[PDB]
Amino acid sequence: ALALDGKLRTDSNATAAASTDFGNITSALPAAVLYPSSTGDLVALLSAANSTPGWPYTIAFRGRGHSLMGQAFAPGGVVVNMASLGDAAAPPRINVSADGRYVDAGGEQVWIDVLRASLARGVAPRSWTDYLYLTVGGTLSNAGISGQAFRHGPQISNVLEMDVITGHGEMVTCSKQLNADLFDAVLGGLGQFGVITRARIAVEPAPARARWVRFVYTDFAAFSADQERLTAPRSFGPMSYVEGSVFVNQSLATDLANTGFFTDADVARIVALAGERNATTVYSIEATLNYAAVDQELASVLGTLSYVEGFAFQRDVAYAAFLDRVHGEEVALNKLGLWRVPHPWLNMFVPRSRIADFDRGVFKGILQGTDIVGPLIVYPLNKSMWDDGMSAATPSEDVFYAVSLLFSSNDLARLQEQNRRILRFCDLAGIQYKTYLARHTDRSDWVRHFGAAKWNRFVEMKNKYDPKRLLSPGQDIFN
Numbered sequence: 001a002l003a004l005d006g007k008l009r010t011d012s013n014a015t016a017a018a019s020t021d022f023g024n025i026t027s028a029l030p031a032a033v034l035y036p037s038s039t040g041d042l043v044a045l046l047s048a049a050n051s052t053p054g055w056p057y058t059i060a061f062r063g064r065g066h067s068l069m070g071q072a073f074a075p076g077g078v079v080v081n082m083a084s085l086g087d088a089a090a091p092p093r094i095n096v097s098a099d100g101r102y103v104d105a106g107g108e109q110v111w112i113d114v115l116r117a118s119l120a121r122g123v124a125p126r127s128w129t130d131y132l133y134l135t136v137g138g139t140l141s142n143a144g145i146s147g148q149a150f151r152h153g154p155q156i157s158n159v160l161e162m163d164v165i166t167g168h169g170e171m172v173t174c175s176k177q178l179n180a181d182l183f184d185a186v187l188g189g190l191g192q193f194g195v196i197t198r199a200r201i202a203v204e205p206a207p208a209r210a211r212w213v214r215f216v217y218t219d220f221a222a223f224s225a226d227q228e229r230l231t232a233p234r235s236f237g238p239m240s241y242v243e244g245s246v247f248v249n250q251s252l253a254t255d256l257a258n259t260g261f262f263t264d265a266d267v268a269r270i271v272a273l274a275g276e277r278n279a280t281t282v283y284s285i286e287a288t289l290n291y292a293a294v295d296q297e298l299a300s301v302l303g304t305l306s307y308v309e310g311f312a313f314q315r316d317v318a319y320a321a322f323l324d325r326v327h328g329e330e331v332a333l334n335k336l337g338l339w340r341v342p343h344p345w346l347n348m349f350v351p352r353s354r355i356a357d358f359d360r361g362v363f364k365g366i367l368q369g370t371d372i373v374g375p376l377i378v379y380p381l382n383k384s385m386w387d388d389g390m391s392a393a394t395p396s397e398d399v400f401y402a403v404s405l406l407f408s409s410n411d412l413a414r415l416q417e418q419n420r421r422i423l424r425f426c427d428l429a430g431i432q433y434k435t436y437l438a439r440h441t442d443r444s445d446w447v448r449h450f451g452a453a454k455w456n457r458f459v460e461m462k463n464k465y466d467p468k469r470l471l472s473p474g475q476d477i478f479n
């Protein structure tokens, strides 16, 4: 039925393209790839899967395949090429509401396109990812975090409603008011319960510009205290975005230059500072203020901080240019063949009470004396802005840190071993971290990830919405 319409492809080129991801570490060939022209095609697949005894195929939903460890694969199954839903010129897959208070976006749509459509109506989503070439459905199946999340929550806290087709092949509209169980399950739900075909995203009046600062520290305690100050509830302070980065001594000049923020003269000044202080690690807060009034507002906030005097660095850019900053980084790295490489990324949420310990063991310990390529990102988040009824798992403390160690790769085995060593350190130290963007490979690890109560809920939702255990098998939770 679908295959004859050219939609279900089994040819080598189709299966090969759906067999690798951004991680570039694991691969798994699907039996077939669906190229749906409409949500009707997805209903048809899931309905067939639901109603057919001896249905052979697991089903994954490939967004843009930005997964690190095969989460978007369907080994010997069917991968849905979600992008196909956006092929047709009409009808539009992104609709800003009549009053401009939300934007409807297809699950397959990339956030960069949501941005552009929103800005055309003078509005924009409030909560982002660092990198915009990711799908709406993909980030919402994880959490979606960036420097705005401290004050607006992750992207999953900025969804009004969704259309989801479940593993039963039923199209369901869900929200806090209707089918809330599915709504909560799908958000951070790792593609386990159904496919998001549309999500209603909160927007705000679009700021025109961002004053964009980097502040330099040699002292982790000062660096982290200041991040916590900037992101503390008052309602929040003036900063629109707060992240941070870590720079190890061995690759200091190189890693500073690789931010794309510091000029060569800037780098030289920071290298000189680290030298005089014999610092093994340098830290930088990255913050923005969306908008002479800016000058005074910025001066007032900076006055509350304790970065090294002389080491505030400023840029002033269009809001959209700030948001899409990493696109330029990809273009540059790709030209040098340094983008499409293995990415043994380590991402976790570390409770505030143990972040100094993590710094001691990892940044001042394990990572020392290595050539680091890729950003090491660290910044606090506020639990209050997360909904613990949703599937996403976070640490128990009111404040926890996003720690994203974005290693680019004989190097791969070394980096993989290093990541195991970091996790070993955390476990031995009794740090109650949660992984993010990682898949686990046995039951006990997944149960630990969610905790007993949330796991049991996760299973209840799985039985309700995907009883055959077909969906997103690359997460290795039920497969």
Ligand SMILES: *Cc1cc2c(cc1C)nc1c(=O)[nH]c(=O)nc-1n2C[C@H](O)[C@H](O)[C@H](O)COP(=O)(O)OP(=O)(O)OC[C@H]1O[C@@H](n2cnc3c(N)ncnc32)[C@H](O)[C@@H]1O
Pocket (backbone or CB within 6 Å): 022, 060, 061, 062, 063, 064, 065, 066, 067, 068, 071, 072, 082, 107, 108, 128, 129, 130, 131, 134, 135, 136, 137, 138, 139, 141, 142, 143, 144, 145, 146, 190, 191, 192, 194, 195, 196, 197, 437, 472, 474, 475
């Ligand atoms: C590649 C990368 C990823 C990334 C990032 C920067 C880069 C260069 N920066 C991020 C950031 O700042 N903050 C953040 O939260 N995440 C960031 N990411 C990671 C990214 O969110 C994940 O890669 C995520 O998976 C989104 O990527 P993508 O849209 O390409 O989705 P996928 O990898 O193909 O699929 C992931 C899982 O979700 C299921 N899925 C996909 N679409 C749907 C829909 N529509 N409905 C239900 N489930 C869906 C897949 O089956 C798979 O399991």
Ligand SMILES: *[C@@H]1O[C@H](CO)[C@@H](O[C@@H]2O[C@H](CO)[C@@H](O)[C@H](O)[C@H]2NC(C)=O)[C@H](O)[C@H]1NC(C)=O
Pocket (backbone or CB within 6 Å): 090, 091, 092, 093, 094, 095, 104, 105, 106, 198
């Ligand atoms: C954006 O809005 C348009 C309405 O203008 C939606 O287009 C309709 O979509 C349904 C099914 O998705 C079709 O049966 C109709 O024929 C379409 N109407 C028009 C006027 O073309 C579109 O679905 C919306 N997009 C999203 C993702 O919500």
Ligand SMILES: CC(C)=CCNc1ncnc2[nH]cnc12
Pocket (backbone or CB within 6 Å): 130, 131, 145, 326, 329, 347, 375, 404, 406
């Ligand atoms: C959570 C996560 C994977 C964030 C990734 N962020 C980024 N990923 C790749 N390049 C970047 N440059 C700045 N931030 C970058």
Ligand SMILES: *[C@@H]1O[C@H](CO)[C@@H](O)[C@H](O)[C@H]1NC(C)=O
Pocket (backbone or CB within 6 Å): 020, 021, 024, 025, 026, 027, 340, 341, 342
């Ligand atoms: C990673 O990318 C390279 C191209 O540089 C490719 O040859 C290789 O097969 C990929 N590996 C995986 C597991 O995706």
Ligand SMILES: *[C@@H]1O[C@H](CO)[C@@H](O)[C@H](O)[C@H]1NC(C)=O
Pocket (backbone or CB within 6 Å): 046, 047, 048, 050, 051, 168, 169, 170
């Ligand atoms: C799912 O399958 C069952 C048969 O066990 C059937 O009763 C139901 O109609 C199916 N739903 C859809 C939408 O295919």
Ligand SMILES: *[C@@H]1O[C@H](CO)[C@@H](O)[C@H](O)[C@H]1NC(C)=O
Pocket (backbone or CB within 6 Å): 249, 250, 251, 278, 279, 280
């Ligand atoms: C920083 O690393 C360089 C080698 O790359 C070394 O010469 C220097 O001693 C290191 N600085 C400190 C204080 O660790």
